[PDB]
Structure formats: C-alpha cells, structure tokens
RNA sequence: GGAGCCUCGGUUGGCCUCGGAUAGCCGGUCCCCCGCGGGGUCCGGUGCGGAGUGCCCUUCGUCCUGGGAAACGGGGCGCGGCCGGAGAGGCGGCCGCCCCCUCGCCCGUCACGCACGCCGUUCGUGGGGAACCUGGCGCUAAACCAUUCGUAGACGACCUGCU
RNA sequence: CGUUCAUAGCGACGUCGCUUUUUGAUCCUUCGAUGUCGGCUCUUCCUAUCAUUGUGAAGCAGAAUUCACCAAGCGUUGGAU
RNA sequence: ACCGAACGCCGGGUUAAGGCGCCCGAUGCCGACGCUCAUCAGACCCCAGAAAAGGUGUUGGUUGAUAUAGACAGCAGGACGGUGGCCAUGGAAGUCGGAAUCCGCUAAGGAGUGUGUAACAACUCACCUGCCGAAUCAACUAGCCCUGAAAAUGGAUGGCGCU
RNA sequence: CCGCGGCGGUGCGCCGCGACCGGCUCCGGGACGGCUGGGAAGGCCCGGCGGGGAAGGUGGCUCGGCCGAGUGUUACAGCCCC
C-alpha cells in the first residue's frame, strides 16, 4: 500500500510532478536516496540557480523569510510542495502523505523500491546534455552530511550484496530442485504452459 | 545534419596489448599500464583483427560536434600507446637575466623547490602528478627533465612549474624569466 | 494557406470569354494544398500574379487531385522555393527524399517552418522535380544513396513511459 | 557494440501501430527515420514505415535493395522465416503472453490449483536440498 | 477475560543487489589470484528482458467417509537457548522439549436455514483513544508556591541555600 | 590625433542605445490637508569601482600609470566660509 | 476597455476564445518533422520590454572560384634587374605622402603588403616545386543561440519546475 | 367478513426491475456511387527494345576459414531496377 521510489537517477522536477499527483490522490509516497536525484542543465547553472534562491530573503527579519533547506531530501520535498495546493487543508494533508529521505534508512532499505521511468534521466535527457547531482549541489550550498550519508550507504550496500548472494543461491537451488523433480510435477507444469506461463 | 556513419582506425603496434572494458581502454606494454575511461564520449570502440592489430572507433548518426570526438578519442589512444612504448620526456629550460633559478628535486621526482627566482625569498615548492618524475638533467646547464607515461599528467606538471615561476606587477616583455617548456620528446625513440 | 498533409492538385482555368476574345487560352498549374477549396484559391493567387486574371473575370475549368504514379518507389525530389524572410524575399533549392511529390512538398513546408520560421503563407513552390541519384546536390540526401546501407538504432530511448508509470525494473536502451 | 542493423533485407518485428505483431522485411531505407518496408507472407503491404515502431530481429534475408515484392516473397519462403520465427524464444514468449490474456475464469482456477501443488512439490525439494547441503558443510 | 462511548481510514501480500545505458543478466569454471565466499580469464546460455513488477507469492466456502497421486509437514498467540540487526534497529532468523493433528492435487460420498431475484457483504481488527470488572509480579514522587540568595533582575524569569 | 601607426590612449562628420541620482513635458492619485529645505542621527540596498583582493592593457624598463575584467567583502575622514 | 460570448431559475448534451507535466478540468497519444544549450536560455494579441552593430557557436540558403595540366592550408626555397624610376631634397633608390605605373629576365617577383630606416641595409609579404593524400575556399544572406545588456527591500514565463 | 373482483386516486421509509417514447453520445455490421469510368499493386507469363545501379563476374588490396567477408574499376545480364 505504499510507493517507495528510488530517487536515484531521476529528474528533480519530473519526479516531483509524478509524486505530487499521487500524493493528492491519497497514495502514501516515500522517496528515498534523494541525493541521487539529478537535475538537467550543467552543474554551474544549477548552483547559481540555488545561490539566487538563497539571496531571496525577507530584508527586515530574515528569520521569517524563505527557509532555504540545504538537505537534498528537503530540497526535493520543497519542489514537491511547489506542485501542491499547500495552503489548503487538502494540500497539507497531501504533503503529510509524502516522506522523503537523504540516503535510504532502515524501514525502506529492506523494501523493493520502484523507479519512475517517465522521470528517469536515461530516458528524458539526450546523452550529450549535462546535468547536476543534487547531492553535490546540496553539499556546496551548505548541506553538512554528505560524507556521513555516503559511509552509511557503503555499509548498506555491503549488507545488501550479502542478501543478494543468498537470494541467488536459493534461486539456484530452486532451478536444481525443478530438475530433480520434473517427472512428478510434469502434468502440473504442462498446464502452466497451456494457459501461457513458463515460456 | 546527422552523418549516417563516421569512423577511424588506430593500428596498435605488436609490442603493445590494448584491451577495452566496454568503453574504458587499458593499454599495457614495455613501460606499464595506462587506463582511460571514455564513458562520456559515446562511441563504438571495436577492437578487430587476429593478433589484435587495430582499434576501430565508430560513431553513428553524429552531428558536427559529436563527430569531432571520434578523432580525439583515437588521438588520446595513440598517446596512450606511445606512453606505454616510448614514454614522454618534456624538457624545460630555465631563463633569467640575473637571478639564477635554483631548482632542486626532493622526494624522488615529486617535489620541485624553485629558489631565488627574481631574488624572491619565497621558495616555490611544486608537486608533480602521480607517476610523473621530475629530474635535473646533465649535458645542459639550466634545464629540467619531466618523464612519464601519461602525457596529460606530464604536460600539466610542466605547466605547474611554468606558471609557478611567473612575474607579477612588471613588464613581462622585459622580465623574461622562469622555467619554460623547450622540447616535448620521448624517453626512447627507436 | 495552412497545412495538414498536402495533395497535388491540377487546376486549369481561363479568363472567361467575351465578344472580342471568343476562345481564350487555358492555363494549368500544380497547386499543393490540403483540399480542393483552397487549391482553387491558391490557383487564382498565382494566376493573378502572372496574368491579368482574377477569380471574377475567369472560371476554373478543371480542378482535380493528381496521384503519385510511383508511390512505392523511393525518389529524390528537388524543389525550388521562393520564401519571404523577415527581411527580403529569397530563392532556395531544397532536396527531399520521399515516396510522393505531395509528401515531399509537405516535408519542405515543415522544414521551412523549422529552419527559417517561414510560415506557409510566405512561401511559394515554383517547381518540384523528381531527380536521379546524381543531380543531387545535398549531402543530407546523398548519404542514403548507397546499395549496402547499414546502421544501428543505437540509444533506442523507450516510449510507453506510462505503461508502468511505476516499476521495479530500470529500463533498457540497448537492442 | 551493435549486433542488429538496419540492413536491406533485415526482418523486423513491428512493435505497435496498425500492423502490430507482424514481421516485415526492410526493402529500402528512405531517410534518417523512415524505411520502405514489406511483409508479403506476413500480410503487410509495401509501404513506408517509421523505425520508431519497428524493432528488429536477427534475420537478414537476402534480396536486392529495391526489388518488386515477388522477389522478397521468394526470399521469405526460401529461408522459411515464418517457421524460424515461431521456433525462436521471442515468438514463444509472445505466444505465451497472448495465451495468458485469453485465459478464461475456469482456466484461471485450474492454473491456480495446479500452481498451488506444483510450487509445494518444489518447496519441499528445496528445503531438503538446503538441509542436505547443510550436511555437506558439516 | 466481559461489556461500552468515541475517532476513523482501509477491504491478500511482495522480506532489499549494485548499477549500466554506444550495454547488460545468468551460469560454470577445466585454470589462476584473494579473504564457504570475493576478483579474474576462458567457455556455454539468455537479452524487445519468462531467474520477466507485461512479474512473483498466497487462495476464496464448512464438514463427513474411503480411494489414488503427493507425504513428516502443520499447529498449540506451544514452550526454553543461541544468533544477526543502531541510520529512525524494531524486526527476523537459527537450535532443544511437551502435547495434538494428516492439512496441498485428483477422484468418488453426502450433508451444512435452500431464508423463497435486490444495498452498505467480505478483512487489516484483539484497530487508535476515553471510561469500566479479574489474576501474577513490581513500585514507593517530584514540580510549583512560600522562604532564602545576588553570579540575576522593570515585573515575570534566572543562579543559589534550607535535620 | 597619437614623431611613425585609424583603434595603447583617443576620436570628428554621422549613427544606435540605456538611465531616471538633472530639468522639463504631463496632470492619473491626493485640496472633510500624505507636515512643506537643509543639517544632525541610524539602517539597508545599488554599482555606473575612488581604495583594497585577484587579473588581462599599454605609447608598462623601474617608480609612477592610465585602459579594461571578476567584484559592492571592507572602507571612503577632521575642519574654515 | 483585449479575445470569446452578452445573463429568468434548473437537468443532459455541444462548443467558443483559450487550454491539457503538477498546482488545475484535459495528451498517462508509443503523436509527426526539424531547430536550439545559453557562467542573463526560452516560453503566446492588447502586454508590461530592447537597438545599431558583431560572432567558423550551430543550421540552412544564394552566388562565385580552383583543382590530378596535380590544389588548399602545413612543414620550407627565391623575392631580381632596366633603376637613386619620377614628383617630392626634409629625406622615400618599393616603402612620411601623391601623378604613376610598363618592359627585361622570365619560373617569376608589385616600379611594391608591411617591419623598420634621416636614407639604405636587413627582414617580411607571388610563380613553382618535395613530402603528404580529397575535397578545398571565398563573399554574401537568413533561422535559433550568444556579445552588445547598468539600480537601488528579496522576486517572479503566474508559481513549482522543465532540456 | 372474504374476495386485493372492476375503476379511481396512493405508496410510512429505503430500494430495485421492466418495456415504451423524447433528446444525446458512442460501438459493431453490412450494401452502393464517382474519379486519370480512380492511381499504384498483386498473379500468370510470353515476345521484343534500349538505358542505369551495379554482379552468380573479374581485378588491385585487405580480413577470416579453393570458400566466406570487406573495399575498388569497366560495365554485358546469368541480382535487380527503369
Ligand atoms: Mg548557517
Ligand atoms: Mg610599474
Ligand atoms: Mg596621422
Ligand atoms: Mg504621515
Ligand atoms: Mg561592473
Ligand atoms: Mg476581432
């Protein structure tokens, strides 16, 4: 009942729009590995674009003025907020369905997580164009915890490699088990390729 | 417009053995290995012939700026082949009207102390790029030798010690001093 | 004029007879247009430019569509233009490769739009001529003149991005 | 690092459009993005067709670049492409997928019942294998 | 274990490689190197992906008896030990012992209010919160005022002291 | 013009612009009233950069220098009338 | 005040002008063909913003050369004599300027592009080869892009964003 | 009082069905006319007549195991095309 999306490889605005409509229709969404989100146009372009946004501040009392979140997760959360009616009750309710994370923490690390292929960089940009990793961008604009998030993801990736290896070994046993047993499953396996699987 | 196909060939010499992990050419031979990743150039690096005699670089449906890369990849590969076989030797001669630029290497090649440039108390230490090894030559009085396999790293490390020794707030047409690259050659010629 | 995909129309018309000129001469034209209504208009436009002849003073004798006589052959049309810039008016010779004349003129109009921001109403097609392998000046067209033609469809980007709007699998573009 | 090419005489599978799910030999290349195409034996008339909609197989039957339909028909039947295609894994998983769509509710139930058992027989084999392999490790 | 206000949304699950994209996935190594695995080379398979999210898992009436194929699997909110897991762990795993059952796939064999054509059915649910009856083992206060202080102070606040 | 040399630095005859720190035009707003010059005090913003940082230019030997670029971080005073 | 359309109170349909990533009803079309990357991109009548002039940035056109009688750039070899030619002496024998402005040798060199000289000198700038190995090169023109392009609270293709 | 016989108005409250008409918006079939009495195509083949790319060919060179593959030239038809 909960979309978990891997923010990696996705386009900042293009993912946001897809998340926004889903969140409005009551779907609970989790976006994960937000630092991996990457935005079209070269890096310097987008740094300057952020640094302009930082300049925008309420002159008389900046403490009120636009809160420039540095964290990539919070950046993504901000751009998603831009595509909601976030002054309403329904808009706020919708925003509260959304959940966004720098890196991929423990509830979601052991969950298969989807990819929006309509917002995916490989698909949407030409291969000769330039783009910016929203990690670097966040890092250079203030974000403190790039290095920490990086190290935790190494540990996560190592722990995931093991899990995969064990999954592979089981799949291998399954394939061998079928070969061991293929005369006493023969007239089940036959019907599962009359109605069109296994082929 | 889109050019239906363009390509080139690079005939590797029988001394060298090049291999390519996808788009990441690794060239090895007499002096050592040199890898280089062209993931960012977007081309078909074929490697054809028994005895592995030539490297072929296609580029399908390229527009004019895409087709410019075709040659450049080929050229870098040439330099990579050269570096493995012969190597690169950039010679650079020190120049001065007075202050005789006292050079002295340190760790091995690595460090280059450049004392008494223009009478300045500030000693310019200059690192080299890993693999490059500076050395003070004989048979030529004021002259450095930079040797290394990877040309990029050598020529940049030359530039480091060229720009290090620069003259501020003067007429640089008058004050011609510093260590400048005089000859870009090889370690061994054959 | 606007567009859709054009059809070749043969339009013939004459300045209608008087006491003085009892059997006035017929004039024919090759008028490319979306339909016969606008074809007949376009005819009168060209005919007014050339001859003292307006729609009132004349009659269109025969307007009829002309079909491509070799649809399933692939040909090289040389097409001579006359557009209007933001600046002054200009001549061109373009070359297109198509199954049909009409298609080749449609294909021209689109290019003019793209390459020059030239809008239909600005443009005049003078002649459109199917041409040999040779007599082709444009290397865009020439690169397809080859017997053992061969190329891959390299970075074959997916469509159907909203059949699975979400998915487990990251896609593939090698084939 | 390409293996499949828009060659004259390459058979291609038309992914979608009016003539979806049909094989088609490329007669001649018109343009950057448009081929002149035929499928005499596959019920596809000679026409231009955009590359977008056709994905291309591993079958290059040999005829000259602008032959007159008769000859490409002969090259199709000589190679026996219809038989070869069907024997391919690709065509089989197309056939598979079609069958799954056609599946009636009684059929569906039958399968459910069949799988229920078929996976249970595999599961016990797998568990036993694991415990024995555990025995090898010990 | 029993009632009893209130707040509602829901109406099988999916327990995970990394990533690449002018490439990838799986095997197996005969052979070599590293710490049952990791890396390599070589070979054999897939690749409009069937070791496919176009996917996978799970079944959805209850019972009886009396055959076949499949058969030691499941349970008792069964019970004790040994693990792994810290990013916001919050979940699993593996090992002993007690009792009970014969559950998936085909067949026969009957019966279950068959409520007489007709709507919010069907679950997560022993849900969240608030007020109420039973057992077992645990507990035994701080805070504020007042007073005091002056590192503090407009007043509050703050720092201190007082069997 | 600049010994020489159109363009280091300039630039006639012509021409194209921007600006609202000038002054005019204008009269839209306010005449049941928006307190009318300066100075003092205090903050902030701009850059069309005087100085300072890093640089390209010279008719830059040095010193002094104008010309230009990134640039508004920090400065930019005491008095006589 | 523009564009569409002119209002009794309602149901169904259908439109206009405008739209259809998300805010926001509608492209979640396997839409078609091009063009364009901007360290100030661009993004819809009225309308809320820029010019002259530039740019081998890229893309089209137009017109012309020159070429296997061996180009075009790139590596190199000569650049003379009739001759202090004449006007100008203040010095211009090619060279501050200007009227001239042809012949010889010719393979071929202008009575000279400049550097520079008081003036020379010296240097430099055709015609031809040697190597290499197919297109090369010029002048216009018009699309998108860029330069031109400087304001004072922090800020507005409506916003988010978008390649 | 039992007939819910015949007619007339009604339903306590929530419902559903049916066929008939009006107005819509879609779907699927089939049958025709015209045209350059459509254009192309297909199928059968036969007799000729030329021209072009460019070939079961030949040839220089290259790459693989006389054969297969890749360029190059004159070009008839034993690949086609017009
Ligand atoms: Mg801070
Ligand atoms: Mg100085
Ligand atoms: Mg002068
Ligand atoms: Mg006031
Ligand atoms: Mg400035
Ligand atoms: Mg109007």
């Amino acid at each position: 009942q909960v979309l978990v999306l891997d923010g990696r490889g996705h386009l900042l605005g293009r993912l946001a729009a897809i998340v926004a409509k889903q969140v409005l229709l009551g779907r609970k969404v989790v976006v994960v590995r937000c630092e991996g989100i990457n935005i079209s146009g070269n890096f310097y372009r987008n740094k300057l674009k952020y640094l302009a946004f930082l300049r925008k501040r309420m002159n008389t009392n900046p403490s009120r003025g636009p809160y420039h979140f540095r964290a990539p997760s919070r950046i993504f959360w901000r751009t998603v907020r831009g595509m909601l009616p976030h002054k309403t009750k329904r808009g706020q309710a919708a925003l509260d369905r959304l959940k966004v994370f720098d890196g991929i923490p423990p509830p979601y690390d052991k969950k298969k997580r989807m990819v929006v292929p309509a917002a995916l960089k490989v698909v949407r940009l030409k291969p000769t164009r330039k783009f910016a990793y929203l990690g670097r961008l966040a890092h250079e604009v203030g974000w403190k915890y790039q290095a920490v998030t990086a190290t935790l993801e190494e540990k996560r990736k190592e722990k995931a490699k093991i899990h995969y290896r064990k999954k592979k070994q089981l799949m291998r046993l399954r394939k061998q088990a079928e070969k061991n047993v293929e005369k006493k499953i023969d007239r089940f396996t036959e019907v599962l390729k009359t109605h069109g699987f296994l082929v | 417009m889109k050019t239906i196909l363009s390509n080139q060939t690079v005939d590797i010499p029988e001394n060298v053995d090049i291999s390519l992990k996808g788009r990441t050419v690794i060239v090895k031979g007499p002096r050592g290995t040199l890898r280089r990743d062209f993931n960012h150039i977007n081309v078909e690096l074929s490697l054809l012939g028994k005895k592995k005699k030539r490297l072929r670089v296609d580029k399908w449906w390229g527009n004019r700026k895409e087709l410019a890369t075709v040659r450049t990849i080929c050229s870098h590969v040439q330099n990579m082949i050269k570096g493995v076989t012969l190597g690169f030797r950039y010679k650079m001669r020190s120049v001065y009207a007075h202050f005789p630029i006292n050079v002295v290497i340190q760790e091995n090649g690595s460090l280059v102390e450049i004392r008494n440039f223009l009478g300045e108390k500030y000693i310019r230490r200059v690192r080299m790029r890993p693999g490059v090894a500076c050395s003070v030559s004989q048979a030529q009085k004021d002259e450095l030798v930079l040797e290394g396999n990877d040309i990029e790293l050598v020529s940049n490390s030359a530039a480091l010690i060229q720009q290090a020794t620069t003259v501020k707030n003067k007429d640089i047409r008058k004050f011609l001093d510093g260590i400048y690259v005089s000859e870009k050659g090889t370690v061994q010629q054959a | 004029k606007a567009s859709g995909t054009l059809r070749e129309y043969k339009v013939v018309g004459r300045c209608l007879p008087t006491p003085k000129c009892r059997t006035p001469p017929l004039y024919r034209m090759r008028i490319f247009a979306p339909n016969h209504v606008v074809a007949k208009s376009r005819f009168w436009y060209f005919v007014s430019q050339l001859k003292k002849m307006k729609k009132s003073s004349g009659e269109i004798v025969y307007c009829g569509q002309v079909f491509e006589k070799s649809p399933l052959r692939v040909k090289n049309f040389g097409i001579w233009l006359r557009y209007d810039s933001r600046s002054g008016t200009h001549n061109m010779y373009r070359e297109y490769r198509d199954l049909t004349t009409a298609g080749a003129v449609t294909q021209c109009y689109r290019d003019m739009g793209a390459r020059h921001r030239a809008r239909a109403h600005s443009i005049q097609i003078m002649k459109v001529e199917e041409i040999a392998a040779s007599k082709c000046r444009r290397p865009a067209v020439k690169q397809f003149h080859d017997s053992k033609i061969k190329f891959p469809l390299p970075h074959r980007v997916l469509r159907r991005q909203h059949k699975p709007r979400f998915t487990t699998k990251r896609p593939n573009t090698f084939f | 690092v390409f293996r499949r090419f828009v060659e004259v005489g390459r058979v291609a599978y038309v992914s979608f459009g009016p003539h979806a799910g049909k094989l088609v030999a490329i007669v001649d290349v018109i343009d950057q993005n448009r081929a002149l195409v035929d499928g005499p034996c596959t019920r596809v008339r000679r026409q231009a067709m955009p590359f977008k909609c056709m994905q291309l197989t591993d079958f290059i039957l040999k005829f000259p670049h602008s032959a007159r339909q008769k000859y490409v028909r002969k090259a199709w039947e000589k190679a026996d492409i219809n038989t070869k295609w069907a024997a391919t894994r690709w065509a089989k998983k197309i056939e598979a997928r079609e069958r799954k769509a056609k599946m009636t509710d009684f059929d569906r139930y039958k399968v459910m019942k069949a799988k229920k058992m078929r996976n249970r027989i595999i599961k016990n084999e797998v568990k036993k294998l694991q415990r024995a392999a555990l025995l090898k490790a010990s």
Side-chain angles (χ1 to χ4, degrees), chain B residues 38-67:
Chain B
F38 297 98
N39 294 57
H40 80 111
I41 232 85
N42 201 337
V43 296
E44 215 219 37
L45 296 185
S46 309
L47 185 65
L48 67 100
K50 196 154 282 192
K51 313 153 183 176
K52 222 69 67 259
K53 297 219 298 171
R54 56 251 302 282
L55 174 74
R56 203 261 293 285
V57 41
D58 291 335
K59 204 287 109 76
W60 301 91
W61 297 117
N63 48 286
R64 194 154 160 285
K65 268 159 59 260
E66 271 68 306
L67 301 161

Coordinates of all heavy atoms in Angstrom, one line a residue, chain B residues 38-67:
Chain B
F38 N 36.4 6.5 -21.4 CA 35.7 7.4 -22.3 C 34.2 7.3 -22.2 O 33.5 7.7 -23.1 CB 36.1 7.1 -23.8 CG 37.6 7.3 -24.1 CD1 38.5 6.3 -24.1 CD2 38.0 8.6 -24.4 CE1 39.8 6.5 -24.4 CE2 39.4 8.9 -24.6 CZ 40.3 7.8 -24.6
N39 N 33.8 6.8 -21.0 CA 32.4 6.9 -20.7 C 32.1 8.4 -20.4 O 32.4 8.9 -19.4 CB 32.0 6.0 -19.5 CG 32.1 4.5 -19.7 OD1 33.2 4.1 -20.1 ND2 31.0 3.8 -19.6
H40 N 31.5 9.0 -21.4 CA 31.3 10.4 -21.7 C 31.6 10.8 -23.1 O 31.5 12.0 -23.4 CB 32.2 11.3 -20.8 CG 33.6 11.5 -21.2 ND1 34.1 12.6 -21.7 CD2 34.6 10.6 -21.3 CE1 35.4 12.5 -22.1 NE2 35.7 11.2 -21.8
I41 N 32.0 9.9 -24.0 CA 32.2 10.2 -25.4 C 31.3 9.5 -26.4 O 31.1 10.0 -27.5 CB 33.7 9.9 -25.7 CG1 34.4 11.0 -26.3 CG2 33.8 8.6 -26.5 CD1 35.0 12.0 -25.3
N42 N 30.7 8.4 -26.0 CA 29.5 7.8 -26.6 C 29.8 7.2 -28.0 O 29.3 7.7 -29.0 CB 28.4 8.8 -26.7 CG 27.0 8.2 -26.9 OD1 26.9 7.0 -27.4 ND2 26.0 8.9 -26.5
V43 N 30.7 6.2 -28.1 CA 31.2 5.7 -29.3 C 31.3 4.2 -29.3 O 31.3 3.5 -28.2 CB 32.6 6.2 -29.6 CG1 32.5 7.7 -29.9 CG2 33.6 5.9 -28.5
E44 N 31.5 3.6 -30.5 CA 31.6 2.1 -30.6 C 33.1 1.8 -30.7 O 33.6 1.9 -31.8 CB 30.8 1.6 -31.8 CG 30.2 0.2 -31.7 CD 30.3 -0.6 -32.9 OE1 31.3 -0.6 -33.6 OE2 29.3 -1.4 -33.2
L45 N 33.7 1.5 -29.6 CA 35.1 1.1 -29.6 C 35.2 -0.4 -29.9 O 35.2 -1.3 -29.0 CB 35.8 1.4 -28.3 CG 35.9 2.9 -27.9 CD1 36.7 3.0 -26.6 CD2 36.5 3.7 -29.0
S46 N 35.2 -0.7 -31.2 CA 35.5 -2.1 -31.7 C 37.0 -2.3 -31.6 O 37.8 -1.4 -31.5 CB 35.1 -2.3 -33.1 OG 33.7 -1.9 -33.3
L47 N 37.4 -3.6 -31.5 CA 38.8 -3.9 -31.5 C 39.1 -5.2 -32.3 O 38.9 -6.3 -31.8 CB 39.2 -4.2 -30.0 CG 40.7 -4.5 -29.7 CD1 41.5 -3.3 -30.1 CD2 40.9 -4.9 -28.3
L48 N 39.5 -5.0 -33.5 CA 39.4 -6.1 -34.6 C 40.8 -6.5 -35.0 O 41.8 -5.8 -34.9 CB 38.6 -5.6 -35.7 CG 39.1 -4.4 -36.6 CD1 39.8 -5.0 -37.9 CD2 38.0 -3.4 -37.0
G49 N 40.8 -7.7 -35.6 CA 42.0 -8.4 -36.1 C 42.5 -9.5 -35.2 O 42.5 -9.3 -34.0
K50 N 43.0 -10.6 -35.8 CA 43.8 -11.6 -35.1 C 45.2 -11.0 -34.9 O 45.7 -10.4 -35.9 CB 43.7 -12.9 -35.8 CG 44.2 -14.1 -35.0 CD 43.6 -15.4 -35.5 CE 42.2 -15.6 -35.0 NZ 41.7 -17.0 -35.2
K51 N 45.8 -11.4 -33.8 CA 47.0 -10.6 -33.3 C 46.5 -9.3 -32.6 O 47.4 -8.5 -32.1 CB 48.1 -10.3 -34.3 CG 48.5 -11.5 -35.2 CD 49.0 -11.0 -36.5 CE 49.4 -12.2 -37.4 NZ 49.9 -11.7 -38.8
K52 N 45.2 -9.0 -32.6 CA 44.6 -7.7 -32.1 C 45.4 -6.5 -32.6 O 45.9 -5.7 -31.9 CB 44.5 -7.8 -30.6 CG 43.2 -7.2 -30.0 CD 42.0 -8.0 -30.3 CE 41.9 -9.4 -29.6 NZ 42.4 -10.5 -30.5
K53 N 45.3 -6.4 -34.0 CA 46.2 -5.4 -34.7 C 45.7 -4.0 -34.7 O 46.5 -3.0 -34.8 CB 46.5 -5.9 -36.1 CG 47.2 -7.2 -36.2 CD 48.3 -7.2 -37.3 CE 47.6 -7.0 -38.7 NZ 48.7 -6.8 -39.8
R54 N 44.4 -3.7 -34.7 CA 43.9 -2.4 -34.8 C 42.7 -2.1 -33.9 O 41.8 -3.0 -33.6 CB 43.5 -2.0 -36.2 CG 42.5 -3.0 -36.9 CD 43.2 -3.8 -38.0 NE 43.8 -3.0 -39.0 CZ 43.2 -2.3 -40.0 NH1 41.9 -2.5 -40.2 NH2 43.9 -1.6 -40.8
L55 N 42.5 -0.9 -33.5 CA 41.4 -0.4 -32.7 C 40.6 0.5 -33.6 O 41.1 1.4 -34.2 CB 41.9 0.5 -31.5 CG 40.8 1.2 -30.7 CD1 40.1 0.2 -29.8 CD2 41.4 2.3 -29.9
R56 N 39.3 0.2 -33.7 CA 38.4 0.9 -34.6 C 37.3 1.6 -33.8 O 36.8 1.0 -32.9 CB 37.7 -0.1 -35.5 CG 37.2 0.4 -36.8 CD 35.7 0.7 -36.8 NE 34.9 -0.5 -36.7 CZ 34.7 -1.4 -37.7 NH1 35.2 -1.2 -38.9 NH2 33.9 -2.5 -37.4
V57 N 37.1 2.9 -34.1 CA 36.2 3.8 -33.3 C 35.1 4.3 -34.3 O 35.3 5.3 -35.0 CB 36.9 4.9 -32.5 CG1 38.0 5.5 -33.3 CG2 35.9 5.9 -32.0
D58 N 33.9 3.7 -34.2 CA 32.7 4.1 -34.9 C 32.0 5.3 -34.2 O 32.3 5.5 -33.0 CB 31.7 3.0 -35.2 CG 32.2 1.9 -36.2 OD1 33.1 2.2 -37.0 OD2 31.7 0.8 -36.1
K59 N 31.0 5.9 -34.8 CA 30.2 6.9 -34.2 C 29.0 7.2 -35.1 O 29.0 8.0 -36.1 CB 31.0 8.2 -34.1 CG 30.5 9.2 -33.0 CD 29.2 9.9 -33.4 CE 28.0 9.4 -32.6 NZ 28.1 9.9 -31.2
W60 N 27.9 6.6 -34.8 CA 26.7 6.5 -35.7 C 25.8 7.7 -35.5 O 25.5 8.2 -34.4 CB 25.9 5.3 -35.4 CG 26.7 4.0 -35.6 CD1 27.4 3.4 -34.7 CD2 26.9 3.3 -36.8 NE1 28.0 2.3 -35.2 CE2 27.7 2.2 -36.5 CE3 26.4 3.5 -38.1 CZ2 28.0 1.3 -37.5 CZ3 26.7 2.5 -39.1 CH2 27.5 1.5 -38.8
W61 N 25.3 8.3 -36.6 CA 24.3 9.4 -36.6 C 24.8 10.6 -35.8 O 24.0 11.2 -35.1 CB 23.0 8.9 -36.1 CG 22.3 7.9 -36.9 CD1 22.0 6.6 -36.5 CD2 21.9 8.0 -38.3 NE1 21.4 5.9 -37.6 CE2 21.3 6.8 -38.6 CE3 21.9 9.1 -39.2 CZ2 20.8 6.6 -39.9 CZ3 21.4 8.9 -40.4 CH2 20.8 7.6 -40.8
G62 N 26.1 10.9 -36.0 CA 26.6 12.1 -35.3 C 26.3 13.4 -36.0 O 26.3 13.5 -37.2
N63 N 26.0 14.4 -35.2 CA 26.0 15.8 -35.6 C 27.4 16.4 -35.4 O 28.2 15.8 -34.7 CB 25.0 16.7 -34.9 CG 25.0 16.5 -33.4 OD1 24.6 15.5 -32.9 ND2 25.6 17.5 -32.7
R64 N 27.7 17.5 -36.1 CA 29.1 18.0 -36.2 C 30.0 18.0 -35.0 O 31.2 17.7 -35.1 CB 29.1 19.4 -36.9 CG 30.5 19.8 -37.4 CD 30.3 20.8 -38.6 NE 31.5 21.6 -38.8 CZ 32.0 22.6 -38.1 NH1 31.3 23.0 -37.0 NH2 33.1 23.2 -38.4
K65 N 29.4 18.4 -33.8 CA 30.1 18.4 -32.6 C 30.3 17.0 -32.0 O 31.3 16.8 -31.2 CB 29.5 19.4 -31.6 CG 30.1 20.8 -31.6 CD 29.2 21.9 -31.1 CE 28.8 21.6 -29.6 NZ 27.5 21.0 -29.4
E66 N 29.4 16.1 -32.3 CA 29.6 14.7 -31.9 C 30.7 14.0 -32.7 O 31.4 13.1 -32.2 CB 28.3 13.9 -32.0 CG 27.4 13.9 -30.8 CD 26.8 15.2 -30.5 OE1 27.5 16.2 -30.4 OE2 25.5 15.3 -30.3
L67 N 30.8 14.4 -34.0 CA 31.8 13.7 -34.9 C 33.2 14.3 -34.7 O 34.2 13.7 -35.1 CB 31.4 14.0 -36.3 CG 30.1 13.4 -36.7 CD1 29.6 14.1 -38.0 CD2 30.1 11.9 -36.9

